[PDB]
Amino acid sequence: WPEWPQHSDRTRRKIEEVFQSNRWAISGYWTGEESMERKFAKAFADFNGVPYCVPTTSGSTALMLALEALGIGEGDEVIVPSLTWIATATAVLNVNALPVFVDVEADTYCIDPQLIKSAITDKTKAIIPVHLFGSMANMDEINEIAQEHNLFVIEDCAQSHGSVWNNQRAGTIGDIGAFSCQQGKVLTAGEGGIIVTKNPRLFELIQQLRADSRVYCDDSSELMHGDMQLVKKGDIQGSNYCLSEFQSAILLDQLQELDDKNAIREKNAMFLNDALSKIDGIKVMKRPPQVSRQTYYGYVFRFDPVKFGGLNADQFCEILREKLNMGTFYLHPPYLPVHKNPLFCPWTKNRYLKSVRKTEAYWRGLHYPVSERASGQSIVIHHAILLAEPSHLSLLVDAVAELARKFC
Amino acid sequence: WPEWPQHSDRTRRKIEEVFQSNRWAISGYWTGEESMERKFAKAFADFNGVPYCVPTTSGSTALMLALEALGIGEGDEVIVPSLTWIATATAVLNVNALPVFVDVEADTYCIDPQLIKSAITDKTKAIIPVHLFGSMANMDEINEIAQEHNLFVIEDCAQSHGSVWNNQRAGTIGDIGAFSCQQGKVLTAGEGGIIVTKNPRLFELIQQLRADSRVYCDDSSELMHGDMQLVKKGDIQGSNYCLSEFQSAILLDQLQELDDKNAIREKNAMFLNDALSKIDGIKVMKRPPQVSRQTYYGYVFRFDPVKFGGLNADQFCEILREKLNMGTFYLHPPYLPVHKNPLFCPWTKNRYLKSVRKTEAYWRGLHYPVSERASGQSIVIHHAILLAEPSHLSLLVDAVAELARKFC
Ligand SMILES: Cc1ncc(COP(=O)(O)O)c(CN)c1O
Ligand SMILES: Cc1ncc(COP(=O)(O)O)c(CN)c1O
């Protein structure tokens, strides 16, 4: 089976270019030509059809800085989906705000717009929709709600680089878009993050937030070898969340084939959708008409335990991995909801305000039915598998079909 | 003149090893052999003679996590020197605590122990001494004060990798040591950070704080290809501050020659100390008897404006750079004190608690005479210059000597 990550001599070439420039950080001085960071930023901005792009250290930090740039802090509430990686919620706690969970839709696993209004209070300042696995949150409904209630929208696109909703790439629709480039993502450098926005003011603030209150110099063409490209601004307090040049170089390389590989993943995902949907008891995810291009970080399908011998997703996956010989990293059940995830334990850290970290019972006692049911009756196939030949993917289909015949 | 950073085919070899392992992140699965992160951690721990080492994303984040691990948060005060990079103070604000500045010593530019007591209040929980440029803070005095007042000590070693005080490497003396591996530092991968501690409990907490509440599995030798090396713990809430494998690889390479290069820098620094000290009006930094090995991230010497035509450090440096033909990055005046640095502007961010960010007047109105005088009558030579041949360094000495004769 295809493995992940993937590299080529082109990747090595980009790394060699960093060594030749002898500039390993954006805070390093100008050595003659543009930094890998800015070259990648320009390329990704074009890819996303978004005015501004600022690379950073991780998707988690990308989310945090997005919140900081919007002026979110103590006393504020931010609405987030219960089903997602814990970072979507911890980024909120990191800025002293309170994450407020809302359940997801049964057929997309993305935040349910019809449950958002009920969670809005006078403290609500933003919503962080997540385009989970291989689906997009309903940005039409979400932006309508955000507009009516004067709320900001931050798109968590860590699992949807390149997805398109009504001809707008994921991340360009909300006020600020955040991406992760951690190893498992479709665009990766091992570690890495990306922030994008259409607003010029936010672009300046984001730069400062990740470069110790600094911004790019007025004109890079006027720079001489030895001159600093980052200059003081001081409009907003920032810290160091600069991506290394080695990572920006790898991202530049990986980006050149992102659209093509996403196209392959989608072709195969659709193939699976039509094949798996014919099996009684299997339900594929519902694709919104507004989505013209879907990036599949993870291919998800659901099953009815009643029609599959009462198996839970863990057992279902174990059976499939044995039959297909693929690793746990590549075929497994979805995350546990954030409020139930052992990795989510805000109350254990004094750094968090007592008013927002609450107590163990406060979070664990929350109830979000749809999100909770997900890890028990859904199967997630990592995108690398979607790069395999159709003949190979057919084996997965046959496996699910066999298992089904075993209970029919 | 020698430039920085510096690499070799050994550096390229380490990078190729990461590509061969196809594991680019510590959160990636086991691919057969130990991660670059753990190999570097083990090597650096041996280098520092410290029990535990956890690599992270930056020196700024290293400081922040050190504070989080010690339980520092809202309502706490942390004593820091006025003369240092702004991160020493912003890391404190990042955990919702209040940084409290103390002036530095005239002949070392490190926090003045005799001024620390006066700053201690019932809210004080820790002290963050910084081993600035080419000097070490008096750890004897600081640990005595910390012991008497029940305070934690976090050593900011971003500018002193390898320094030795009473046969203990910088960072191993306090409760937790933090290091930066940003491009300009003596040990670098473009971006990067390191945390070290002697305490087993803190080691576990630090791991979780940088890996989303996870720790290393019980035994890596029992791991099969495909298995995750990071496992859930949940004793303390963490976020993602994992160093990429590419960076850990470069650090492993750079570490192998760190001690030798530091030895060269020190030999040359001493040469300069004996030569420059003979010039009327020039004062070298005072080296504590307890320091047996001094890492010179920056070589600093002071001058008496009264004996040097009233020149300020900026003009003095401009003259020297013209005569020696070296860049501003390599020869320049010290930082402005943190409270006066335009990059330090806590009041501009809502993320910070109103109680700790205060106002512009609160910080800018502070007064720390020694730290303030530093940027006006001190010259800093970047460590790369200290790797030059003695004959070349003599040119610097001749330049200062010429300038002196011009005012005599
Ligand atoms: C929705 C979401 N947000 C944020 C993150 C964090 O990304 P990172 O591990 O690069 O800090 C992830 C997982 N990578 C995620 O799935
Ligand atoms: C004392 C000190 N602390 C922390 C830092 C921050 O280091 P970093 O740029 O790797 O986040 C620096 C400068 N690198 C520093 O001099």
**B179: CB partners within 8 A, 6+ apart:** B59, B62, B157, B158, B161, B171, B185, B187, B193, B194, B195, B196
How many angstroms separate the CA atoms of A32 and A221, rounded?
9
Assigned domain for A183 exists: yes
CATH assignment of the domain containing A132: 3.40.640.10
Q: Which of B86, B88, B99, B144 is closest to B125 using CA atoms?
A: B99
Q: How many A from CA of B62 to the centre of ligand 2?
A: 9
CA distance linking residue A290 with residue A298, whole number of Å: 19
CA distance B275 to chain A (A): 28
Q: Are residues B313 and B389 in the same domain?
A: yes
Q: Has residue B3 been placed in a domain?
A: no
Domain membership flag for residue A388: yes
Domain count, chain B: 2
Helix %, strand %, coil % of chain A (to 5): 40, 15, 40
The DSSP line for B103-162 is: -B-TTT-SB-HHHHGGG--TTEEEE--B--TT----HHHHHHHHHHTT-EEEEE-TT-TT
Residues of B within 8 A of A350 (CB-CB) are: 68, 71-74
User: Does the CB of B72 have a partner CB in chain A at under 8 Å?
Assistant: yes
A402: left (phi over 0), alpha (psi -120 to 50) or beta: alpha
Q: Same domain for A16 and A88?
A: yes
User: Is B2 part of any domain?
Assistant: no
Whether B180 is in the pocket of ligand 2, judged by its Cβ within 6 Å, is yes
DSSP state of A228: B
Q: Name the residue in chain B with its Cα closest to that of A16.
A: B12
Which of B191, B202, B251, B253 to substitute to test the interface with A, most A CBs within 10 Å?
Answer: B191
Look at residue A3 and tell me if it is in a domain. no
Question: Which of A255, A289, A319 is the last residue before a domain boundary?
Answer: A255
For residues A103 and A325, what is the distance between their CA atoms, to the nearest angstrom?
34
Is the minimum CB–CB distance between B201 and chain A shorter than 8 Å?
no
Q: Do residue A24 and residue B190 have CB atoms under 8 angstroms apart?
A: yes
Residues A262 and A403 reside in one and the same domain = yes
Residue of B nearest to A328 (CA): B226
Residues 88-147 of A with CB under 8 A from B: 90-91, 93-96
Q: How far apart are the C-alpha atoms of B253 and A24, rounded to whole Å? A: 15
**Co-location of B304 and B212 in the same domain:** no
Q: By the CB < 8 Å criterion, does B185 face chain A? A: no
Q: How far apart are CA B346 and CA B366, in angstroms?
A: 14
Residues B20 and B98 reside in one and the same domain:
yes
Question: Same domain, yes or no, for A136 and A26?
Answer: yes
Phi then psi for B130, rounded to 5 degrees? -115, 130
How far is it, in rounded angstroms, from Cα A265 to Cα A297? 9
Task: Please say whether the beta carbons of A125 and A78 come within 8 A.
Answer: yes
Same domain, A177 and A225: yes
**Who contacts B118 (Cβ-Cβ below 8 Å, separation ≥6)?**
none
Residue A388 sits in a domain of what CATH number?
A: 3.90.1150.10
* Contact between A350 and B235 using a beta-carbon 8 Å cutoff: no
Whether residue A3 and residue B25 make contact (CB cut-off 8 A), yes or no, is no
Cα(A77)–Cα(A124) distance, integer angstroms: 4
Quick count: other Cβ atoms within 10 Å of Cβ A271?
Answer: 15
Nearest CA, atom 11, ligand 1: A60
Centre of ligand 1 to C-alpha A341, Å, is 15
Burial B33-52 (b: 16+ CB within 10 A, else e): eebbbbbbbeebbebbebeb
Nearest to B31 by CA among B41, B42, B40, B22: B22
Q: What is the domain range of residue A270? A: 256-408
Mapped onto helix, strand or coil, the DSSP state of residue B304 is: coil
Query: Are both B232 and B283 inside the same structural domain?
Result: no
Binary contact (B183, A95; C-beta < 8 A): no
The string of DSSP letters for B198-232 reads: S-HHHHHHHHHHHBTTEEE-S-GGG--TT-BSEEE
A156 lines ligand 1 (CB under 6 A): yes
Distance of CA B214 to the CA centre of its chain: 26
Residue B276 CA to residue A358 CA, distance in Å, equals 60
Q: How distant, in Å, are the alpha carbons of A225, B1, B269, B394 from that of B274? A: 33, 22, 9, 12
**Distance of CA A85 from the midpoint of ligand 1 (Å):** 6
Q: Does residue A1 belong to any structural domain of this protein?
A: no
- B167: how many CB neighbours lie within 10 A of its CB? 9
Q: Domain boundary at B210, B239, B255, which?
A: B255
User: B211 and B327: one domain?
Assistant: no
Any domain includes A291: yes
User: Of A255, A289, A317, which closes a domain?
Assistant: A255
Instruction: Work out the number of other CB atoms within 10 angstroms of the CB of residue A390.
Output: 12
Tokens matching residue B383: 């460590």
Q: Which residue of B has its CA nearest to A354?
A: B74
- A44 and A196 in contact (C-beta within 8 Å)? yes
| Domain presence at residue A2 | no
C-alpha–C-alpha distance, residues B168 and B88, integer Å: 22
CB-based contact, B36 to chain A, within 8 Å: no
**Residues of B with Cβ-Cβ distance to A215 under 8 angstroms:** none
Ramachandran angles phi, psi of B378, nearest 5°: -135, 145
- Which positions in chain B touch A93 (Cβ < 8 Å)? 237
Of the candidates B226, B237, B351, the beta carbon closest to that of A349 is on: B237
- Residues A35, A133 within the same domain: yes
Structure-token match 């495909």, residue found? B226
According to the entry, how was the structure determined? Answer: X-ray
Find chain B residues with C-beta within 8 A of A239's C-beta.
60-61, 87, 90-91, 94
Sort residue A317 into left (φ over 0), alpha (ψ -120 to 50) or beta.
Answer: alpha
Element (H, E) at B319: helix B313-324
Residues A163 and A301 in one domain: no
Contact predicate B30/B226, CB 8 Å: yes
Instruction: Please tell me whether residues B200 and B235 are part of one structural domain.
Output: yes
